[PDB]
Amino acid sequence: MVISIRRSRHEEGEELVAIWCRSVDATHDFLSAEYRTELEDLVRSFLPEAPLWVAVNERDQPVGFMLLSGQHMDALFIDPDVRGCGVGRVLVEHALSMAPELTTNVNEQNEQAVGFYKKVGFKVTGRSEVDDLGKPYPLLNLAYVGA
């Protein structure tokens, strides 16, 4: 299966919410149901309108997405069915092509993604003791070192 990356459309936004939801079910399950619900609502109020980039398969059908502006890839999420297919690299490489000095973040609870992003080449450059709203779910900040 072929992959390309492009800007998202609006109407496919709900598929990106769906992708985020299974990425969370597969690798961030530590997210308590209350926080899951509030994230999913704000995500559904954001991914349909955010200036994202989507990985698409041969059907021009989204299989992952990435948010990058400046040199900061704030978000990267991909359907667990095709994560193993290397789309994780393809989206990071897209981000790197626009930003050679790339940075990103990841929730600390997803130690799997911390490991993955290190394999890809990131190295931790900061953290937070909460996620954002004072919730005790730390965020980590990383820079491409990978090298």
Domain count, the chain: 1
Which experimental technique did the depositors report for determining this structure? NMR
In DSSP notation, 40-93 reads HHHHHTTTTTS--EEEE-TTS-EEEEEEEETTEEEEEEE-HHHIIIIIHHHHHH
Rounded-to-integer distance, Cα 130 and Cα 137, Å: 5
Query: Could you list the residue range(s) of the whole structural domain that residue 121 is in?
Result: 1-147
The one-letter amino acid at 85:
C
Provide the angle, in degrees to the nearest 10, between the axes of the packed helices 111-120 and 88-98: 60
CA 47, chain centre distance (Å): 11
**Is beta strand 62-69 parallel, antiparallel or unpaired with respect to 72-78?**
antiparallel
Rounded-to-integer distance, Cα 7 and Cα 46, Å: 15
Q: What is the CATH number of the domain that holds 145?
A: 3.40.630.30
Burial class for 133, CB neighbours closer than 10 Å (0-12, 13-18, 19+): exposed
Q: Give the long-range contacts of residues 12-16, CB within 8 A, separation 24 or more.
A: 12/54, 12/62, 13/44, 13/47, 13/48, 13/49, 14/44, 14/48, 15/61, 15/62, 16/47, 16/48, 16/52, 16/54, 16/62, 16/65, 16/77
Instruction: Specify whether the CB–CB gap between 77 and 64 falls below 8 A.
Output: yes
